[PDB]
């Protein structure tokens, strides 16, 4: 019954002309609720979920002000990093940041996080104890020494354990109709003959929420991984997700195979078998 809130930020420099492209999105579990795009006309934090549109003007003005201050720090960082790595000003680079908090089943603070990356690789991250830092290289080491003297961890720990948890619980209640509801996967199986002696059985899991799910194939009550295929979980586009697993079997022996579906929206796992 745990839940989380997370913010993702991406900044891409554009040496040819202008400022970096900045995009920020907020999520509660697997539901996006806010976004900001430096390329958009509003230049404001915008709603992406109906339950967040309940917040008044002071909320949106405050979030907009903060996300802008966020983009400016990233703009500065891109330049600072370019120097740390002694890189040319002609190429485009990327800085990413992700932070947030988790609440356990008891709805109390469980864990917090604050990680940073440069060009797609770990740069510096705040440890689980929320007091020490993990620096990937010597560029990150200099950043770490500066953040220790300024006591950045302490400031973050206060937010992650307090403000972050408090707002996560508020959002959870305001959007309880969907956020506190699980959507069990709708399942079925398809059969396709690949030859005169072989056939493919595909097990489908549709319209489920949250995204976390496990699909497994068994043959005569035993797990089978050979001759199977599992696609990565994908968004349906309406807030739910999709997944399927397939196995190639000898024509006429389909009944030996069973598809097992595990999901928190299910009291107990589902077992499907072909007619």
């Amino acid at each position: 019954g745990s839940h989380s809130m997370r913010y993702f930020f991406t900044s891409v420099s554009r040496p040819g002309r202008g400022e970096p492209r900045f995009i920020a999105v907020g999520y509660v579990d697997d539901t996006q609720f806010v976004r900001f795009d430096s390329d958009a006309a509003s230049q404001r934090m915008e709603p992406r979920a109906p339950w967040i549109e309940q917040e008044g003007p002071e909320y949106w003005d405050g979030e907009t002000r903060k996300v802008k201050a966020h983009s400016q720090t990233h703009r500065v960082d891109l330049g600072t990093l370019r120097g740390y790595y002694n890189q040319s000003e002609a190429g485009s680079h990327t800085v990413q940041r992700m932070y947030g908090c988790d609440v356990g089943s008891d709805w109390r603070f469980l864990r917090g996080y604050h990680q940073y990356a440069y060009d797609g690789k770990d740069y510096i991250a705040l440890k689980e104890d929320l007091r020490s830092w993990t620096a990937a290289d010597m560029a990150a080491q200099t950043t770490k020494h500066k953040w220790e003297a300024a006591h950045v961890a302490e400031q973050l720990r206060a937010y992650l354990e307090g403000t972050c948890v408090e707002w996560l619980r508020r959002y959870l209640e305001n959007g309880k109709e969907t956020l506190q509801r699980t959507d069990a996967p709708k399942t079925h199986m398809t059969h396709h003959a690949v030859s005169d002696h072989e056939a493919t059985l595909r097990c489908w899991a549709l319209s489920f929420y949250p995204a976390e799910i496990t699909l497994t194939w068994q043959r005569d009550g035993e797990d089978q991984t050979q001759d199977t295929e599992l696609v990565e979980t994908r968004p349906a586009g309406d807030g739910t997700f999709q997944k399927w697993a397939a196995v190639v079997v000898p024509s006429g022996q389909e009944q030996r195979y069973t598809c097992h579906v595990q999901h928190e929206g299910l009291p107990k796992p589902l077992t499907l078998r072909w007619e």
Partner: protein, 99 residues
Amino acid sequence: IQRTPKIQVYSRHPAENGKSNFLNCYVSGFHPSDIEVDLLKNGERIEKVEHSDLSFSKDWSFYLLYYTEFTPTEKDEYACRVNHVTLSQPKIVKWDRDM
């Protein structure tokens, strides 16, 4: 570092000729974020296509969902065309009703 995109083309609901639906092209696991994605109908580019807000996974790789409303028929062919810095030439994934 750079990472090549994984690609999945599919409809939001079970495909049925004559019935309005949505066509999706899901690209993920790539880096950097600049990418070009187009949906095609009988080899021609579709104009009314939208996409989700840029986001990323635990390993920092990006993912985006491109989509458009459409009505499948027994003849019309659909596919997704993706171009990225890690790709020598544009990659094209044809839509398959059973996938």
